Write a protein that binds this ligand. Structure first.
Ligand SMILES: *CCC(=O)Nc1ccc2ncnc(Nc3cccc(Br)c3)c2c1
Length: 307
């Protein structure tokens, strides 16, 4: 049958890392920033730690361990654009240890660095995610949570994907997955995903569309001031996210194409890579950003030391 995934997980001790501050927070997530002191060795490395409330419920300890597995599984050959699980520690709570990305979740970076953002970078990233998401498709896994918050920034030239926790790995055949889930990110989901609770690879392509919309709108909220319950009902009326002000009509078409009701009529990921790569060569043509020429952002990775 299929090949064995020989990749391992470094199960490592608590005494060695010291958590500094909380980077991201949610009812589902409480992820820290914390330096790690690796036992005996004379090295110190920064890292991010993710934890949930102490294990009153085992089902809780199972769900977190599931995420550790899948995140673990991808080192595989490995990818430049996909985040790698570093380690794990065991405590009444169960801790995930992920190599920290300095600039944080990409969504925030766009909201604060709206100025000096390039017409180039935005196009470049979409290629970056489209590259990353295809690798997931190749692995027969659906991330199932793609969103702006879930893309990390190693450098302004490099971005990565993360937070698999919802995501579910796929066996051969096994084209689609249906699950009874308590909490999901409704706004970033496909119509069939909301109605039938069915998740596909093309379900992910939808979320991609909303994600790029978030990027092109500079970190605006999808559907500014609209309740979560109503959303399932309005989309079948045909309404989608409005055109972002800065998008040339070519780009918007690609965003709209990701929101087709027919799951097959949406673009596949290889298609998205090629389209955006083609745009990338001449960004000015495909993105009108005021004063785009001369934008500030820093090529060599010069100092970001200040906290
Ligand atoms: C929007 C908040 C946020 O995600 N901040 C942030 C900054 C830097 C990171 N570096 C590495 N990983 C993560 N997120 C993450 C997700 C799941 C599990 C773990 Br241990 C870490 C961040 C997140």
């Amino acid at each position: 049958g299929e090949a064995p995934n020989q990749a391992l997980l470094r199960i490592l001790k608590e005494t060695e890392f010291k958590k500094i501050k909380v980077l991201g927070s949610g009812a589902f997530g409480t992820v820290y920033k914390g330096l790690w002191i690796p036992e005996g060795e004379k090295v110190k490395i920064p890292v991010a730690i993710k934890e949930l409330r102490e294990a009153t419920s085992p089902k809780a300890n199972k769900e977190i361990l599931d995420e550790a597995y899948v995140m673990a599984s991808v080192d595989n050959p490995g990818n430049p654009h996909v985040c790698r699980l570093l380690g794990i520690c065991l405590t009444s709570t169960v801790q995930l240890i992920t190599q920290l990305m300095p600039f944080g979740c990409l969504l925030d970076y766009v909201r604060e660095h709206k100025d000096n953002i390039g017409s180039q970078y935005l196009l470049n990233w979409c290629v970056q995610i489209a590259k990353g998401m295809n690798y997931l498709e190749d692995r027969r896994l659906v991330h199932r949570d793609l969103a702006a918050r879930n893309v990390l920034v190693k450098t302004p030239q490099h971005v990565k994907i993360t937070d698999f926790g919802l995501a579910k790995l796929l066996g051969a055949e096994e084209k689609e997955y249906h699950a009874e889930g308590g909490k999901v990110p409704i706004k970033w989901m496909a119509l069939e995903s909301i109605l039938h609770r069915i998740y596909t690879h093309q379900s992910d392509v939808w979320s991609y569309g909303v994600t790029v919309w978030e990027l092109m709108t500079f970190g605006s909220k999808p559907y500014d001031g609209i309740p979560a319950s109503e959303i399932s009902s309005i989309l079948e009326k045909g309404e989608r996210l409005p055109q972002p002000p800065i998008c040339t009509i070519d780009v918007y078409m690609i965003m709209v194409k990701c929101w087709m009701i027919d799951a097959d009529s949406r673009p596949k990921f290889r298609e998205l890579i090629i389209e955006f790569s083609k745009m990338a060569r001449d960004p000015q043509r495909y993105l009108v950003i005021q004063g785009d020429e001369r934008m500030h952002l820093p090529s060599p990775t010069d100092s970001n030391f200040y906290r």
